[PDB]
Structures are given as C-alpha cells and as structure tokens.
Amino acid sequence: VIVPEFNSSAELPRPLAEKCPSIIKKFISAYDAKPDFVARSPGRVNLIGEHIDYCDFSVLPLAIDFDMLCAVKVLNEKNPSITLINADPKFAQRKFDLPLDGSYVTIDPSVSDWSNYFKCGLHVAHSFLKKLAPERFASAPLAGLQVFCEGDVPTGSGLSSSAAFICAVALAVVKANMGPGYHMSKQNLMRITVVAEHYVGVNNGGMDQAASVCGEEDHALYVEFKPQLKATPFKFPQLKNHEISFVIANTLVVSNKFETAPTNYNLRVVEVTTAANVLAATYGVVLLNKGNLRDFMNVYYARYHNISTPWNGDIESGIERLTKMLVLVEESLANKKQGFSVDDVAQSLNCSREEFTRDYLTTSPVRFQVLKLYQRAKHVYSESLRVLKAVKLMTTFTADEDFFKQFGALMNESQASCDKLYECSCPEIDKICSIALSNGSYGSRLTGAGWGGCTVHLVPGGPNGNIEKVKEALANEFYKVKYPKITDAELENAIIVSKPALGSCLYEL
Ligand SMILES: Nc1ncnc2c1ncn2[C@@H]1O[C@H](COP(=O)(O)OP(=O)(O)NP(=O)(O)O)[C@@H](O)[C@H]1O
Ligand SMILES: OC[C@H]1O[C@H](O)[C@H](O)[C@@H](O)[C@H]1O
Ligand SMILES: [Cl-]
Ligand SMILES: [Mg+2]
C-alpha cells in the first residue's frame, strides 16, 4: 500500500475536506501564489504499551483527528532555499539555503527551534532521496520550497504533534522532489521517519511515526518493531449494547520530551539499556549500540533454552517468555530496589567507571544520582506482557462488560506501573484517573511519555453510554478546580472523544 493521494475530483477524507481550503488561503496570503499540494499527518494516541517501543516491544496506538498540514510550493531557483511559515505566531518564520553540493543541512540541538524539527524530516527525506535517485541527488541540491504550516495537534500534549510534523514534512519533501507521478509507500515513509527525532537528540522508538503513517479510519494498530517493522490495523470488537470509546483528557500540563530529556526521557532509555546489560552479565551472556531488554530475552532463551530462532511475536510464546523474564528480574535486580550507583553498575559489568561512562553516559547526556534498573526493567517486561493480552482481548466475550473490565484492568495496571515503577506519571494525571474511574471509566491511564500531557479512558460510548457522565465530572471535579479561569471552549478542547483517523496523506492542487 501507498500513501493516499487525493485530488479535487476525489468524497474527500473529512479532515482534508475540512481544513485544506483554509490552509490554501493562508498560503496564498503568505506567498502570493497557489501551493502545489498539501501534506497531512495526524497525531496519535497510545491505548497501551508505554515506554517499551525503544526496547523493541510492540504497542497499541491509534491515529487521531488532530493533524499537521503542510502547504507546499515547488520552486525553480538558481540557489535553492526553504522558507517556512507557520499559522502560529509562536512559530516564527524561518528561511534557509540548501547546500549546492547536495550535502545535508546542519541540525543543531543546542537550540530549541521549530525549524529543527522541519530539518529533521528534511534530513530523513533527503537520505532516502539520495538512495532512490543518486543520479539526481548525489552531489546536487533538492528543490527549493515555500512552506506553510498549520497544526491542530496540541503541543507538549503527549499526542505527538512532533511526529505529525515530521511525517508531514518527510512526505512533502519526497513528493516535491519525485514529482507527481511518484507514489510513496506507507512502509518507506514509516521506515524512514521512525528515527528522525534522534537527530534532535531524543532517543525514542518509532511508535509515533508508525501510527501517524499507518493510521486507518476506524482502525487501531498493532505496531511491531522486530523481527520486522510493521503496523497492523484492526477494528475493535463488536459489542452488542455498547460502543467501545476512548476519551482523551488533557491535563493541560505541558510536557516537552526534549526539554527534560536528560533527567526524564533519555534517562529512562539509559536505565533500561543499562539494565539489559546487567542482566546479561548476571546471566553470563553477551548481548550483541548496546543490546536491549528484548535482546536479553532472546539470548537467554537461546543460550539456556536452546531456542535458535528469535522471538517472532507469537503471542502465546511471548506471554511465556516475558513471565519468565519477570522472574529473572525479581531474582537478580530486586536486591537493589534502592537504585544502582555507577559503582554498583560498573562492578556489575566488570568495568571501570570510565568504561561505563564512555560506553553508556555519553552518547546522550543524562543527569542522575542513581539508576533504577529494577523498576525500569520490571515495567518494561510487564508492560510488554500487558500488550500481548490486550491484543488477545481486541481480537478474541459474552457480556459487553466482560470486555470493559478486562481491558480496563490492563489499562489500570499500566497506569500503576507507569507511575510506581517508571515514575512518569503526575498529580494531575493521577487526579484525572481517579475522577474518571469513579465516574464511568473502566480504565484510565496516561498516554505518551507522561510527566503531564494527556490521558486516555475506556468509556462505554453511544446511547447506552457514559461519555457525558465522565466529561461532566471531569469538568467539575478537575478542570474547573485546577483551572478556574478555564472557558467552556478551552474545556471543550481539553476533552475529546477519539475516533481512529486516517494516517499520512496527500492533497493535490
Ligand atoms: N504545530 C507545530 N508547528 C511547528 N513546529 C511544531 C509544531 N508542533 C510541534 N512542533 C515542533 O516540534 C516540537 C516537539 O513537539 P511538542 O508537542 O512540543 O513536544 P513533544 O514532547 O516532543 N511531543 P508531544 O508532547 O507528544 O506533542 C516542538 O517543540 C516544535 O519545535
Ligand atoms: O511510550 C512513550 C512514548 O514517548 C514519546 O511519545 C516517544 O516519542 C515514543 O516513541 C514513546 O516511547
Ligand atoms: Cl538535509
Ligand atoms: Mg511529551
């Protein structure tokens, strides 16, 4: 399958139908000419499977009706450049020249600037282009461009406005250079965007990109990273008397992953990697760039269970192995519930503090006193396990309530883990979850990285449903309390009932 291109002639996807026209006007106002096409990429929600992506564990995301639109115009210039315009005053106009030799544009994390994120998508698109038409792009520049950007994904909301942006850009950039007769495959799109953020210093998994790219209206996705990168859409189960609905409630606590990366995001990545390596050593194995927790799982099994072949995702076998993994964590990491010092670790790995450091603490700077290897691994394994179960549910119920509860429970377990083991929750999240559970929710948890941002709630929808009940309670018990100045409008914007949206796409003009 390819990324869908739409035209004027083309019923048009709601979102396109609804937003293009306007963006189109903005572009004219901005550049005094009509754009050539419009690239879109949505935001996303992760139903379950938090902070396991970077360990190669599979997740349960969904694309939402919030997106990023890029109106583009392709230019013929002697000395090609890129002009960036944003609908949001917050984002100032940027303009830069593309190296004539066909080299890459410098990305400097030293600065927190929106153009950086653009450059990120540019880069990946570029790299890809070089491979595709080396002839054309080897030592020559890409087309200059005029870009107008308008996103409705709330920033630092944990709904990944970041990925919606990057993906839209990568898409647009490939199209602009390949031309109209060229059609991107969702797979390539995905595959190239999944690491874009690393350029900006954030070592995340590709969950965000995978969802933005693979979303399908009315479909949830089961994203896998190994043995192969893959997204598989599915429809929720059909209940008899009810609707499966997911409600998002923004805490309104701004959480930008980059800003706190060293003590937050990136610190987690380190603890888990570290843990993976300690376990190895503790079990006398060699992991392989260091190995991850999934790596340890395969190796152990390979070395001690004689299983030659690496885990394929088979659900049943997975449940089994993870459970086991949980046992080993308990058996070997639990003595340091308090945390491992660099000393404890280095000793654990037969290292010098310097080795540990070169090898682990320098690729990305992190700040800490201790490393919580026990809890982080524990979370990872258990959260992974939770996914496998969720998938089974979503796939294989007498009473509707049987699903509500079962799935809800998993969600609740995930929240607890996130909060107690991974420590990425927050009072506001905590408060939202409590209110929701008591008022109609079956499962409540943060979504995305945590440390603020949004929450997801499994609530029975439709006529026989409780959406309004929850909404109301939240309004009265949380928002109106924590944010007295909040307006019905803002409120409305803080609570959303989500429907799976379509992923990346194109509009031609
Ligand atoms: N609408 C937008 N327009 C321009 N740049 C954007 C936009 N949305 C995101 N960006 C850039 O991408 C960065 C990351 O998105 P942001 O939402 O702020 O934080 P995040 O924690 O990385 N992701 P998330 O919380 O999941 O949305 C921002 O700080 C901007 O530099
Ligand atoms: O699950 C937490 C989530 O955090 C951010 O949203 C990252 O971009 C994702 O790759 C993922 O790790
Ligand atoms: Cl580049
Ligand atoms: Mg975030």
CB distance 204 to 54 below 8 Å: yes
Strands (E) located in 204-334? 220-224, 230-234, 243-250
CA-wise closest residue to 496 among 66, 133, 95 = 66
For residues 300 and 305, give the distance between their C-alpha atoms in angstroms, rounded to a whole number.
Answer: 7
> CA 235 from chain center: how many Å?
20
- Helix and strand numbers, DSSP H then E, in the chain: 17, 13
* Cα distances (angstroms) measured from residue 72 to each of 2, 3, 42: 20, 17, 17
The per-residue DSSP string of 335-371 comes to GGTT-B-HHHHHHHHT--HHHHIIIIISSS----S-B
- Selecting among 36, 67, 208, 295, the annotated active-site residue is 208
Q: What values do phi and psi take at 40, rounded to 5?
A: -130, 150
For residues 148 and 70, give the distance between their C-alpha atoms in angstroms, rounded to a whole number.
Answer: 6
For residues 214 and 58, give the distance between their C-alpha atoms in angstroms, rounded to a whole number.
Answer: 15
- The CA radius of gyration of the chain, in Å to the nearest whole number, is 23
Q: Judge whether 488 counts as a catalytic residue.
A: no
Give 288-295's long-range contacts (Cβ < 8 A, gap of 24+): 290/359, 290/360, 292/54, 292/55, 292/56, 293/55, 293/56, 293/57, 293/325, 293/377, 293/380, 293/381, 294/55, 294/56, 294/57, 294/226, 295/56
Classify 39 as helix, strand or coil: strand
CB distance 467 to 31 below 8 Å: no
For residues 407 and 244, give the distance between their C-alpha atoms in angstroms, rounded to a whole number.
Answer: 11
The closest ligand to the CA of 446 turns out to be 2
CA 157 / ligand 4 centre spacing (Å): 6
Q: Annotated binding site for ATP, which residues?
A: 156, 158, 160-161, 255-257
H or E element in which residue 21 lies: helix 14-31
* Cα distances (angstroms) measured from residue 45 to each of 61, 456, 498, 503: 5, 8, 9, 12
DSSP code of residue 421: I
List, in order of start, the domains of the chain with CATH numbers.
1-238+499-509 (3.30.230.10), 239-259+425-498 (3.30.70.3170), 260-424 (1.20.1440.340)
The per-residue DSSP string of 468-486 comes to HHHHHHHIIIIIHHH-TT-
Q: Which two tokens stand for residue 103?
A: 């080299």
Strands (E) located in 76-201? 81-86, 94-97, 144-151
CA-wise closest residue to 393 among 48, 63, 51, 46 = 48
For residues 205 and 201, give the distance between their C-alpha atoms in angstroms, rounded to a whole number.
Answer: 13
Q: How many residues does the chain have?
A: 509
Strands 94-97 and 81-86: antiparallel
Strands 37-48 and 505-508: antiparallel
CA-wise closest residue to 399 among 235, 234, 241, 236 = 241
Q: Which two tokens stand for residue 362?
A: 């320098």
Neighbours of 499 (CB within 10 A): 15
DSSP code of residue 238: P
- Terminal CA-to-CA distance of the chain, rounded, Å? 22
Ligand 1 pocket, CB under 6 A: 86, 88, 91, 114, 117, 149, 151, 155-162, 165, 255-258, 448, 453
Which atom of ligand 2 approaches the CA of 51 most closely? Answer: 1
Q: What values do phi and psi take at 35, rounded to 5?
A: -65, 165
Classify 388 as helix, strand or coil: helix
- At what resolution in Å was this solved? 2.4
For residues 155 and 86, give the distance between their C-alpha atoms in angstroms, rounded to a whole number.
Answer: 14
Residue owning tokens 């941002």: 453
Ligand 2 in contact with 50 (CB < 6 A)?
A: yes
Task: Choose the residue to mutate in 194, 208, 224 for probing ligand 2, maximizing ligand atoms within 8 Å of C-beta.
Answer: 208
